[PDB]
Amino acid sequence: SMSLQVNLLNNTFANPFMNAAGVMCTTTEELVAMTESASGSLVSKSCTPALREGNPTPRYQALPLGSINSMGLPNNGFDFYLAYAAEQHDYGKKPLFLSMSGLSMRENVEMCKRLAAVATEKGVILELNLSPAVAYDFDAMRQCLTAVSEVYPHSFGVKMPPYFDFAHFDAAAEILNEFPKVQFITCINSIGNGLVIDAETESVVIKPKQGFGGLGGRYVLPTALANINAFYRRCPGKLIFGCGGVYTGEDAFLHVLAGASMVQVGTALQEEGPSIFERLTSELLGVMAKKRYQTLDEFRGKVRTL
Amino acid sequence: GSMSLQVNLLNNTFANPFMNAAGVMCTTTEELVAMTESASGSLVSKSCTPALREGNPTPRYQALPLGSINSMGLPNNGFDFYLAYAAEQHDYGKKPLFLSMSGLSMRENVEMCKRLAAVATEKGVILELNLSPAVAYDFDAMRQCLTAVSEVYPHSFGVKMPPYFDFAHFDAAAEILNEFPKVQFITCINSIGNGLVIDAETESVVIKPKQGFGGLGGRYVLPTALANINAFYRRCPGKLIFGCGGVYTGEDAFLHVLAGASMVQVGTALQEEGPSIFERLTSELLGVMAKKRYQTLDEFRGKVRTL
Numbered sequence: 001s002m003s004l005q006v007n008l009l010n011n012t013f014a015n016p017f018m019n020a021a022g023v024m025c026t027t028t029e030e031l032v033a034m035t036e037s038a039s040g041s042l043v044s045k046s047c048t049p050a051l052r053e054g055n056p057t058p059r060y061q062a063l064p065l066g067s068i069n070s071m072g073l074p075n076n077g078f079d080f081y082l083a084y085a086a087e088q089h090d091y092g093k094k095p096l097f098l099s100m101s102g103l104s105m106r107e108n109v110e111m112c113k114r115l116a117a118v119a120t121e122k123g124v125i126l127e128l129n130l131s132p133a134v135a136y137d138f139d140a141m142r143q144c145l146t147a148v149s150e151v152y153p154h155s156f157g158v159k160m161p162p163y164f165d166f167a168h169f170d171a172a173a174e175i176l177n178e179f180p181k182v183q184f185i186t187c188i189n190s191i192g193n194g195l196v197i198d199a200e201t202e203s204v205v206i207k208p209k210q211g212f213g214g215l216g217g218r219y220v221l222p223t224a225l226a227n228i229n230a231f232y233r234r235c236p237g238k239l240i241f242g243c244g245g246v247y248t249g250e251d252a253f254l255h256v257l258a259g260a261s262m263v264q265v266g267t268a269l270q271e272e273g274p275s276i277f278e279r280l281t282s283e284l285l286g287v288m289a290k291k292r293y294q295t296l297d298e299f300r301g302k303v304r305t306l
Numbered sequence: 307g308s309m310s311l312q313v314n315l316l317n318n319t320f321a322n323p324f325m326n327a328a329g330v331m332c333t334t335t336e337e338l339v340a341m342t343e344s345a346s347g348s349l350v351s352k353s354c355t356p357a358l359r360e361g362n363p364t365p366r367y368q369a370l371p372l373g374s375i376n377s378m379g380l381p382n383n384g385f386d387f388y389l390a391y392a393a394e395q396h397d398y399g400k401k402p403l404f405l406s407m408s409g410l411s412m413r414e415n416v417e418m419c420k421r422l423a424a425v426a427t428e429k430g431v432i433l434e435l436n437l438s439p440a441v442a443y444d445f446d447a448m449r450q451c452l453t454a455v456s457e458v459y460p461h462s463f464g465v466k467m468p469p470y471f472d473f474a475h476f477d478a479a480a481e482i483l484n485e486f487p488k489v490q491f492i493t494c495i496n497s498i499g500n501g502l503v504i505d506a507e508t509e510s511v512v513i514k515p516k517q518g519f520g521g522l523g524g525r526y527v528l529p530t531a532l533a534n535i536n537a538f539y540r541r542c543p544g545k546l547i548f549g550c551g552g553v554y555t556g557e558d559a560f561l562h563v564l565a566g567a568s569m570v571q572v573g574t575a576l577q578e579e580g581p582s583i584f585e586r587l588t589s590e591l592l593g594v595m596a597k598k599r600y601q602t603l604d605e606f607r608g609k610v611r612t613l
């Protein structure tokens with residue numbers, strides 16, 4: 001007998017799967033579809049205080065090894081997602097995360113002040129997007145978390161861009177550990193500012209920023225696993241959510257082995273739609289069956305070093 | 307049409323833009339001779355320290371479907387060895403030679419450069435100074451290092467860079483590099499640092515040092531490499547860019563050059579296939595150029611179209 005159940009943040013989740021923020025979670029229809037899916041949870045599109053059109057198109061391109069995008073935070077605005085969380089989400093089906101991505105400290109502070117009562121009343125959980133990106137400037141990062149912690153009377157998580165050396169893992173973890181309200185860390189947002197060139201057209205493939213954009217998919221799995229495990233080790237008091245390169249149950253298995261509690265799906269979900277979650281739960285159970293595991297706790301964070 | 311892969315830079319002529327990446331098949335005399343005998347346009351010797359280094363415990367390199375992961379730890383025969391190869395053994399009649407230097411402190415690099423100067427003068431060996439927390443990730447330390455080396459090394463040289471991941475960092479690094487006219491080329495990029503490969507079957511990491519964390523190469527890194535190549539191509543118009551990262555085919559090389567590359571270095575692919583790869587890559591790049599109606603590299607270098 002097996003189970004994908006996860007228990008964390010005073011909630012129970014049927015399985016660890018959820019969408020990545022930015023993917024299939026912008027409109028009412030999308031949020032409802034995520035709620036009706038087999039996913040264990042969902043997160044609403046990273047929001048700004050007011051609606052944002054986002055960058056000019058094309059701004060997303062699917063690729064053999066993943067995706068590249070420079071969406072530019074298109075979203076319906078904070079009021080919209082707050083109302084979804086306050087009055088529409090069926091918390092009886094699954095828990096809900098709200099992703100917040102204010103463009104200044106002030107914006108985050110203002111939104112958090114209003115989110116507080118809805119979190120208290122309904123149980124929505126904040127995922128604060130820190131992905132130059134806030135998390136790549138340690139002073140800006142400390143300031144952001146100080147501000148939010150000061151005005152937001154609840155636990156929350158942070159969505160991180162990837163780091164690429166131990167000095168940075170140490171520096172980031174030192175900061176995160178100074179904030180006990182940060183109860184989860186989502187690793188990772190894209191690998192930033194890659195450049196895809198189409199040999200046939202001799203051109204870039206997205207319009208904004210001269211073709212530079214965030215990489216997702218197969219490209220990022222080892223970087224994601226690195227960041228998941230690095231923070232799993234360095235922030236023992238916190239949960240880690242995995243994000244990056246999940247297409248299969250086996251991929252998800254790797255995230256959990258590295259330390260992941262929840263596993264977010266981006267590029268693969270963009271291409272397949274919310275039905276992917278039935279496939280992913282099935283595949284992960286199958287991997288666990290073949291390896292003789294009954295629960296996620298049996299192998300979470302147990303990757304073997306040499 | 308008669309096409310040419312010729313490249314001209316730093317008072318040298320290169321038959322084609324291809325060379326090995328530093329770290330790959332360039333450690334021993336036998337390897338250096340084989341690179342020289344190959345169809346490559348050039349070669350670079352293994353990044354050296356002042357004295358020989360055994361490197362990290364094995365396993366420390368693993369080939370992967372989408373590339374490679376490694377934590378070699380700078381195993382090398384020592385500066386004396388590569389200096390001797392450059393001064394006395396290398397056939398400059400066959401192709402130009404780059405020497406990769408990777409001191410573990412600013413002082414080590416300074417002392418090696420003092421001694422390399424005479425050999426650069428006499429034989430024409432070209433320095434690629436490895437700046438890959440990595441020196442290049444510490445802007446003050448980077449400026450400091452380039453100042454100290456420029457002070458003692460009266461020759462043009464290049465720097466090998468780790469990748470950056472945002473415009474603010476592209477600008478900051480370019481600003482520093484633009485302070486040093488002796489830095490005539492920039493090699494982008496070394497490796498995507500500290501990835502972690504986990505083998506689902508064994509439920510373990512695949513290399514031994516650093517709990518399995520190591521540098522990524524191959525298919526994983528091509529868009530990051532192209533971004534860095536083009537970012538510096540744009541921001542350092544007075545310098546040349548050498549590409550490194552994700553080259554398996556002539557088409558990949560075409561992309562490097564489109565992004566701004568003058569020379570194109572081959573790492574993971576070369577590790578897996580050996581030096582015969584250069585015959586294949588030259589032939590493939592010429593084929594790509596023939597199909598796209600280009601005769602020379604200068605016709606499309608850095609000409610990637612934005613939308």
Ligand SMILES: Cc1cc2nc3c(=O)[nH]c(=O)nc-3n(C[C@H](O)[C@H](O)[C@H](O)COP(=O)(O)O)c2cc1C
Pocket residue numbers: 020021022023045046060067069071073099129131159188189190215216217218220243244245246264265266267268270
């Ligand atoms: C179309 C698109 C939009 C995204 N927007 C957001 C976003 O609003 N907030 C966020 O934290 N991450 C955003 N991201 C990054 C994803 O959340 C995720 O971190 C990344 O795609 C890695 O997962 P993948 O490898 O599964 O694609 C976006 C990604 C894509 C592809």
Ligand SMILES: Cc1cc2nc3c(=O)[nH]c(=O)nc-3n(C[C@H](O)[C@H](O)[C@H](O)COP(=O)(O)O)c2cc1C
Pocket residue numbers: 327328329330352353367374376378380406436438466495496497522523524525527550551552553571572573574575577
């Ligand atoms: C085995 C191995 C050893 C390496 N050692 C060095 C080195 O000594 N000096 C250096 O600048 N880069 C070193 N690197 C990085 C490579 O030069 C190259 O930048 C990287 O592998 C990306 O190219 P690829 O995608 O073609 O593998 C090494 C890479 C590999 C795979």
Ligand code: NI
Pocket residue numbers: 136443
């Ligand atoms: Ni930094």
